[PDB]
Write an enzyme that holds these catalytic residues in place. Structure first.
Site, PDB file in Angstrom:
ATOM      1  N   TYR A  45       0.827  -1.198   0.000  1.00 55.26           N
ATOM      2  CA  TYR A  45       0.000   0.000   0.000  1.00 55.26           C
ATOM      3  C   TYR A  45       0.866   1.255   0.000  1.00 55.26           C
ATOM      4  O   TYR A  45       1.986   1.290   0.486  1.00 55.26           O
ATOM      5  CB  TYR A  45      -0.979   0.091   1.189  1.00 55.26           C
ATOM      6  N   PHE A  55       2.644  10.992   3.586  1.00 56.84           N
ATOM      7  CA  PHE A  55       2.654   9.939   2.571  1.00 56.84           C
ATOM      8  C   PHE A  55       3.392   8.722   3.107  1.00 56.84           C
ATOM      9  O   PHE A  55       4.549   8.825   3.438  1.00 56.84           O
ATOM     10  CB  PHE A  55       3.397  10.283   1.280  1.00 56.84           C
ATOM     11  N   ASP A  56       2.742   7.566   3.169  1.00 49.66           N
ATOM     12  CA  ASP A  56       3.238   6.416   3.913  1.00 49.66           C
ATOM     13  C   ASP A  56       3.128   5.182   3.027  1.00 49.66           C
ATOM     14  O   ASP A  56       2.167   5.013   2.290  1.00 49.66           O
ATOM     15  CB  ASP A  56       2.452   6.194   5.200  1.00 49.66           C
ATOM     16  N   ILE A  75      -8.040   0.094  10.158  1.00 48.52           N
ATOM     17  CA  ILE A  75      -9.191   0.969  10.215  1.00 48.52           C
ATOM     18  C   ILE A  75     -10.354   0.265   9.538  1.00 48.52           C
ATOM     19  O   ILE A  75     -10.111  -0.567   8.661  1.00 48.52           O
ATOM     20  CB  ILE A  75      -8.919   2.353   9.602  1.00 48.52           C
ATOM     21  N   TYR A 101     -10.002   7.533  11.359  1.00 51.05           N
ATOM     22  CA  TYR A 101      -9.606   7.847  12.742  1.00 51.05           C
ATOM     23  C   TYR A 101     -10.517   8.824  13.462  1.00 51.05           C
ATOM     24  O   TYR A 101     -10.250   9.177  14.651  1.00 51.05           O
ATOM     25  CB  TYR A 101      -8.193   8.408  12.737  1.00 51.05           C
ATOM     26  N   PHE A 118      -5.792   5.792  -0.140  1.00 55.49           N
ATOM     27  CA  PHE A 118      -4.844   4.707  -0.317  1.00 55.49           C
ATOM     28  C   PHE A 118      -4.900   4.128  -1.729  1.00 55.49           C
ATOM     29  O   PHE A 118      -5.953   4.119  -2.410  1.00 55.49           O
ATOM     30  CB  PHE A 118      -5.063   3.547   0.644  1.00 55.49           C
TER      31      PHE A 118
HETATM   32  C1  LIG Z   1      -2.164   6.026  13.154  1.00 53.41           C
HETATM   33  O1  LIG Z   1      -0.842   5.476  13.074  1.00 53.41           O
HETATM   34  C2  LIG Z   1      -0.374   5.126  11.833  1.00 53.41           C
HETATM   35  C3  LIG Z   1      -1.102   5.148  10.650  1.00 53.41           C
HETATM   36  C4  LIG Z   1      -0.528   4.691   9.469  1.00 53.41           C
HETATM   37  C5  LIG Z   1       0.800   4.275   9.477  1.00 53.41           C
HETATM   38  C6  LIG Z   1       1.505   4.178  10.664  1.00 53.41           C
HETATM   39  O2  LIG Z   1       2.788   3.711  10.756  1.00 53.41           O
HETATM   40  C7  LIG Z   1       3.303   3.024   9.611  1.00 53.41           C
HETATM   41  C8  LIG Z   1       0.925   4.618  11.850  1.00 53.41           C
HETATM   42  O3  LIG Z   1       1.518   4.590  13.098  1.00 53.41           O
HETATM   43  C9  LIG Z   1       1.996   3.375  13.699  1.00 53.41           C
HETATM   44  C10 LIG Z   1       1.254   2.121  13.285  1.00 53.41           C
HETATM   45  C11 LIG Z   1      -0.192   2.077  13.733  1.00 53.41           C
HETATM   46  O4  LIG Z   1      -1.015   1.536  12.674  1.00 53.41           O
HETATM   47  C12 LIG Z   1      -2.274   2.203  12.637  1.00 53.41           C
HETATM   48  C13 LIG Z   1      -3.266   1.310  11.922  1.00 53.41           C
HETATM   49  C14 LIG Z   1      -3.088  -0.197  11.980  1.00 53.41           C
HETATM   50  O5  LIG Z   1      -3.158   1.715  10.525  1.00 53.41           O
HETATM   51  C15 LIG Z   1      -4.230   1.511   9.739  1.00 53.41           C
HETATM   52  O6  LIG Z   1      -5.200   0.903  10.093  1.00 53.41           O
HETATM   53  C16 LIG Z   1      -4.060   2.138   8.346  1.00 53.41           C
HETATM   54  C17 LIG Z   1      -4.292   1.071   7.276  1.00 53.41           C
HETATM   55  C18 LIG Z   1      -3.161   0.031   7.309  1.00 53.41           C
HETATM   56  C19 LIG Z   1      -1.833   0.696   6.974  1.00 53.41           C
HETATM   57  C20 LIG Z   1      -1.525   1.830   7.989  1.00 53.41           C
HETATM   58  N1  LIG Z   1      -2.717   2.751   8.188  1.00 53.41           N
HETATM   59  C21 LIG Z   1      -2.609   4.097   8.293  1.00 53.41           C
HETATM   60  O7  LIG Z   1      -3.594   4.767   8.607  1.00 53.41           O
HETATM   61  C22 LIG Z   1      -1.249   4.804   8.147  1.00 53.41           C
HETATM   62  C23 LIG Z   1      -1.450   6.278   7.699  1.00 53.41           C
HETATM   63  C24 LIG Z   1      -0.194   7.152   7.816  1.00 53.41           C
HETATM   64  C25 LIG Z   1      -0.304   8.552   7.151  1.00 53.41           C
HETATM   65  C26 LIG Z   1      -1.047   8.637   5.836  1.00 53.41           C
HETATM   66  C27 LIG Z   1      -2.260   7.769   5.814  1.00 53.41           C
HETATM   67  C28 LIG Z   1      -1.961   6.341   6.268  1.00 53.41           C
END
Ligand SMILES: COc1cc2cc(OC)c1OCCCOC[C@H](C)OC(=O)[C@@H]1CCCCN1C(=O)[C@H]2C1CCCCC1
Length: 128
Positions: A45, A55-56, A75, A101, A118
Site C-alpha cells: 500500500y 505519505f506512507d 481501520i 480515525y 490509499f
Molecule cells: C495512526 O498510526 C499510523 C497510521 C498509518 C501508518 C503508521 O505507521 C506506519 C501509523 O503509526 C503506527 C502504526 C499504527 O497503525 C495504525 C493502523 C493499523 O493503521 C491503519 O489501520 C491504516 C491502514 C493500514 C496501513 C496503515 N494505516 C494508516 O492509517 C497509516 C497512515 C499514515 C499517514 C497517511 C495515511 C496512512
C-alpha cells in the site's frame, strides 16, 4: 488527481451508503474469490492524507503488510475495502473520518476529521 478522481467516480462500498468508503479498481485481479472475514491477508500500500501532506508506504517497510481481515486490526475502511478485492487487484480508496480515525484522530500522524487516500494491492489471502 487520484483522490479527486475517487470522489467523482468511485463506487460507495459502505453498507450504509454514506460514501464513507469510495473505491476504484485500478488493476483487475484473478479469480472470483474475495477474502472472508478472518482470512490472513497480504498487501502492499501507499497512503496519504487527502490534503496530500503526509505519505506512507509498505515499501518503506520493504515487506508486505499483513493482517487478519475484519478483526479490527486496521481501520474500518480497510476491513471493508480489502474484503471487496481479488488477489492481484490494485484499488484506490478514499475514506471519510468515520471509517478511519474519526473526530479524535490519532496524533501526531493523523489530525481530527482526516480524509485518507490509499492505493492498495492485494497480494494474497489465506484461511486462518
Ligand atoms: C495512526 O498510526 C499510523 C497510521 C498509518 C501508518 C503508521 O505507521 C506506519 C501509523 O503509526 C503506527 C502504526 C499504527 O497503525 C495504525 C493502523 C493499523 O493503521 C491503519 O489501520 C491504516 C491502514 C493500514 C496501513 C496503515 N494505516 C494508516 O492509517 C497509516 C497512515 C499514515 C499517514 C497517511 C495515511 C496512512
Amino acid at each position: 488527481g487520484a483522490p479527486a478522481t475517487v470522489t467523482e467516480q468511485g463506487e460507495d462500498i459502505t453498507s450504509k451508503k454514506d460514501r464513507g468508503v469510495l473505491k476504484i479498481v485500478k488493476r483487475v485481479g484473478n479469480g472470483e474469490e474475495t477474502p472472508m472475514i478472518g482470512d490472513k491477508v497480504y498487501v502492499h500500500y501507499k497512503g496519504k492524507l487527502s490534503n496530500g501532506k503526509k505519505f506512507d508506504s509498505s515499501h518503506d517497510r520493504n515487506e508486505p503488510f499483513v493482517f487478519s481481515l475484519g478483526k479490527g486490526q486496521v481501520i474500518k475502511a480497510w476491513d471493508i475495502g480489502v474484503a471487496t478485492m481479488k488477489k492481484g487487484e490494485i484499488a484506490h480508496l478514499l475514506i471519510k473520518p468515520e471509517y478511519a480515525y474519526g473526530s479524535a484522530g490519532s496524533l501526531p500522524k493523523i489530525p481530527s476529521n482526516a480524509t485518507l487516500f490509499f492505493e492498495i494491492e492485494l497480494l494474497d489471502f489465506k484461511g486462518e
